[PDB]
Amino acid sequence: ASQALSIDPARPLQTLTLPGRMPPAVGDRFTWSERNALLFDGISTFNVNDGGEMQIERMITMYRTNKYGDSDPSYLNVNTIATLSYLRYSLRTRITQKFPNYKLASDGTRFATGQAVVTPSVIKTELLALFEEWENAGLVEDFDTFKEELYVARNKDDKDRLDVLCGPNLINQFRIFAAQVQFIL
Amino acid sequence: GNQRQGVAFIRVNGMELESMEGASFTPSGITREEVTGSRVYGWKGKPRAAKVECKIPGGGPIGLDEIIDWENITVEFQADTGETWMLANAWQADEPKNDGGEISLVLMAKQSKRI
Amino acid sequence: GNQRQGVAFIRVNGMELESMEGASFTPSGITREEVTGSRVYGWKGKPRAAKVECKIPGGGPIGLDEIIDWENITVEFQADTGETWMLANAWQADEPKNDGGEISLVLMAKQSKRI
Amino acid sequence: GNQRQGVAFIRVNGMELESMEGASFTPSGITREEVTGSRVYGWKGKPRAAKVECKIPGGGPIGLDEIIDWENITVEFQADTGETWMLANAWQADEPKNDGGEISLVLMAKQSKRI
Amino acid sequence: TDLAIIWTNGRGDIAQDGIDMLTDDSLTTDVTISLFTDRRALDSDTLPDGSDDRRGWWGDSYRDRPIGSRLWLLSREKATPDTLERARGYAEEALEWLKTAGRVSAINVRAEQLHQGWLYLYIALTLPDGSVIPYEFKAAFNG
Amino acid sequence: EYPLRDTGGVNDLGKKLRSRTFSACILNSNAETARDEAGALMDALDAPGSGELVHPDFGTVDVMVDSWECRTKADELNYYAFTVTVYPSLQ
Amino acid sequence: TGKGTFRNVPFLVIEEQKQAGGRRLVKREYPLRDTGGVNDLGKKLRSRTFSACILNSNAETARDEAGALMDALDAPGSGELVHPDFGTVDVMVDSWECRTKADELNYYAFTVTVYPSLQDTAPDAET
Amino acid sequence: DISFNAIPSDVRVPLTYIEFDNSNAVSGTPAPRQRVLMFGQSGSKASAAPNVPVRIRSGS
Structure with missing residues (x-):
């Protein structure tokens, strides 16, 4: 799991063989219905290949209910956790690389060119460019809604603190392979 | 009766350039060309890249030594009445010359988005 | 003593653009060329496509993002003194560049038809 | 509110020339060009050489006989507000012609450095 | 007239019909077998698993043709157009053997992403004027 | 041409075949229907026997294909151009 | 995305592509007769060809990619060519070129022609 | 096309409908x-x- 999620976070783990592992006997392996019902209870499942080697069928976190008490599928996939961690790291390192130590000034103020000043309208464009890089990489889906939902402002209570609200849209993985054959008789 | 257009502001990496009047901006998309036989059949696409051209006064805080080595910048062509176009990963273009007192800058990019 | 000509309005999909002065409209038909040997023989036809060209002041309600994506529209080149020509199903053409404060629009179509 | 640009002085071997207005200076670097296939792919570099062009009024202390024979000189393109660029070992270029009263000088060099 | 491949719970097993197993003599069984059986991956192809074996059939060196389709290369994929194009190509190369013979006339296959997490393939085969009306069914789930 | 004499002989033996050739192009704005049409025309150009050709300049005629190309310039996204030379079938 | 590959070595497509091939004809012209014609003889192979380019912003990754592409084009056997226009076809290479210009520091141009890798015996033994 | 209701909500295994x-x-x-x-x-x-x-789709 670590190797796969380090190579590419937004990639499912539908068929990954476990090398050098001995599966249980054919009388102990969970049936299809048993595995299906067990996947809802927050426990991941395994499958046995055509050869003797066993593989992981689906990796799922034990998260099954929201804070208020109802069911919530947001944090189900481990891919969401991995992608979120990578996105947080990318944001942190891009901000650190671009604006290490800059003065903070209001949006409308203008100073001498070539000075170290950041305005709330600069980091917004920086984040939009970062999102476009994410979309090129293949981890985020929709750019228009991200642009229309992104919000960056000054704190208005503490002088040097900038509040952001990104709300990105993660990419999706293929679970079902629907096919439809049509005979033109 | 809002202001239509005027002096346009160029910003790379978050720094203004104070370019002189005459800034131009070509967005990136598909170019349509006609195809003609016995009649006109339709259009034939051709890709193009986004580009921003301007001229800056010489002797300013940003000099040619800094200008030449530009291969990864985030350009923002912004008008007076909003209408900002962002070039994600742009690079300098064919030739800078310090003719008279104006340096001609042209920055090209693979994609142009509206902010 | 009727009014001859002046600012000519362009309407795409039933909306105006406020095109500045200098609009041009080439109609669709047959292009005649001369064939000469020992003595002049006649004419040799050649098809062409309708085209309407204008310039839009920048910063207006209609921007470059909407202007670029135009491949199925109905155009209405209407002069001051009536005489409207409908371009059938037009598409945007070679290159829009926003120099100064002007967007150079050109729309080509397979059939211009007088209304 | 510093002075931006104006008359730019040229110095060869530590001696001024009194060049008339209109001096130009193209620095040495890499020329970028765009490569377009199905989409835009990137940039394709290309080397270039530094060059300083100006005009000297005729009849002065320095004449065409001395101007022609220049294949190892150190040029110093200095603007009004400092910002001097040095050409280490420059050589005269294509053609001097004394039309009117102006000798058109152009000096090429392999490398230009900002002092 | 051979047995029929009946799809239940995502896998296809033979089923009974009255006295013996239900029979079918049409292109349905020919397609559902040529599409959903793993054939040998090439030497250069990369495998979805971390393993190193390539599927196939021991009779591949006996039946004069590779048996099935390489659609098992898309076991784990993310929603990008690259996978859609690859699936279209793999289906075409798997079903080309029908058009090489005279059992179909033309094949048109398109790929799309339906409701999030769905790879949708639309395959249209043009049967000639001498083809037995083929079998039709829908996959069903039980228990 | 007879040596050491001015005169020469010229004789006729039949008529040469008509080597009619043409160029065509198919483009569609869908950029996928264009590929479908190009594939269909390729399959119809490579086929056994002789099939009828309808052309504005030539008209209905029965011919056999000899060669063709699909020169797409990559930059063009909808354009496919063929160039075909055909000869009459022997009857 | 124009990302054609030959043996999982990626390349970018440019210039012009080409597929050519038709039936082989034998021209039958009779002496002192006007009506003639041709006779069908099979169908010649489909000779595909393409032009690809390897470019980068590093001038060393470009060299490495070009070397990999050369060593993968010059390999024994038949490889899965992927092309945005041709599709996925197993083909056998016939020739190629690697053109630079000593002025472009990143550009490497290739021009390849391939033939289908179909191998069927002449006698076609039966029972 | 294929209705979203085709696949039952009780399944979370990769399925490959046909x-x-x-x-x-x-x-x-x-x-x-x-x-x-x-x-x-x-x-x-x-x-x-x-x-x-x-609505009928087949003679059977």
């Missing part, structure tokens, strides 16, 4: 649609409510 058809509609898109109506009697053991339209 469907077969026999019509002539190649595009699959809703062109100007034709809905021919058919009046007719039905014999005994019909097991169909009289006087209500029924």
